[PDB]
Amino acid sequence: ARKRSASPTKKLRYVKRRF
C-alpha cells in the first residue's frame, strides 16, 4: 500500500488579461 500522487496538471500557464 503506497501513496499515489496527483496526476500532472495540463494547464501549464495561468495568465489573465485586463478587459
Add this chain to the structure above:
Amino acid sequence: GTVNWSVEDIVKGINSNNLESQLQATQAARKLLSREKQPPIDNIIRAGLIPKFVSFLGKTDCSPIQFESAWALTNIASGTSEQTKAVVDGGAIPAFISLLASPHAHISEQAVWALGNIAGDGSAFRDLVIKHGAIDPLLALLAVPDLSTLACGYLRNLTWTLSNLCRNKNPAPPLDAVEQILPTLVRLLHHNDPEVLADSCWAISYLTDGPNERIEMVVKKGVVPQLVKLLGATELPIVTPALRAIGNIVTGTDEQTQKVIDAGALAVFPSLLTNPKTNIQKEATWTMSNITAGRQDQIQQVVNHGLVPFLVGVLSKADFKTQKEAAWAITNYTSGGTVEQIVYLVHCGIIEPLMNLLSAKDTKIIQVILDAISNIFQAAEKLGETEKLSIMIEECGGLDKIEALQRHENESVYKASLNLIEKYF
C-alpha cells in the same frame, strides 16, 4: 479620441517626442489590447512598441503614461509564452518591481498584475521574477493590521500573483521564497473574501504538491484545520482547491495524514463522496485512497466515520475515473487492514460492485481489483471461511469474469486470475 486606432497611428504617436501625444497613443494601444476578440498583440510587438512601453514605466513625472503602459504590457504578457517572453526581454520585470512601490494604488495594482502574468508563464520566469526581488515589495503591500482595509480587487490581484509565485514544479519554487511567502499566505487563508480564499487554497495546493519536506513546511504553519474548515465551505471554487490541498497533504507521511484526520476532515467526506460535481467526487475518492494506504488505526478511523459504505456506493455507481480511484482505495484498505477490517469491508457489500467492475477495459483497474480480491481471500483463509467468499463471488457472477480474464492479453491479469482460480476455485 483614443478608440479604434491603427497600429500605424499608435506608432506615429509614440514616436513623437511629445509626451502628451505619447500618452494618448499609449492609451489607444491599451484600448486596442483590451478588446474582447483577438487583441493585436503580435502586431504591437512587431511594431517595436514594447521597449517604448517599458521606458514609459519609468516616467515618474507622468503617472498616467506609467499606468497606460503597465496595462498594455500586462495584456501583452497575458498571451502566449513568446509574447510574455517579449515583455520580459524588454526589461519589464525590474520596472514593474520598481512600480510596486508607487504612491498611486492603481499603478501598483497594475504592476502586481503584470508580474503575476510573467510568473504564471512558468517556473523559469517565476524564478526570474523572484531573483529580481519582487517578493519583499509584494509582501510589504500586504503588511497591514487588517486586510479588510485594502481594496477588494487590489487584495485579490495580490493573492493571485502570490499564488503564481507558488505555482509549478520542475523545479518547485525556492525554499527560502516559500518560507518568506507562507506567513502572509496563512493570513490570507484566514480572510473572508471568497476569491482570496480560493487563490490562497490554490497556492497551498501548489506548495503541498511535492515531497514530504514541502508538505511539512506547510503543515507546520498550522493551516490544516483552516483547510478542513474551507473543505466544508459552500462555494465550489473554495472546496476544490481546499480538497486538492488536503489530498496532497495525505500523500505524505503517516503523521501528516494524521494531522488531516485530527482536524476532522473525515466528517466532511459523506458529502464530498456524494457531491454532484464529478471532479469533487474523484478528488475525494483519491484522497480516501491515500488515507486507506495509511496505518491500521487510520483505516479504523475511516471505518468509525462510516465511510466504507460511501466507498461501496462510489464503487457501485460513479464516473469511471472515480470508480478507479475507489478501486485503488479498496486495494490499499485490504493491503494494510486487519482481518476484522477486511471482513467488515465484505459485510458492507464490496464484493458485488468490485466484481461488476472487472468488466472494464482498463487493465490496471482489473489488476487492482484482482489484488484486492487476493487480499480478501487471504483474510478469509486466516479465518477458514474461503468457501463462503467463493460462494459469494460465484453467486455474483465474478467467477465467470475471472475465468474470462484468464485469457486476458496482459500477463499479470492472466497469472493473477489463474492463481485465484487454482487456489480458491
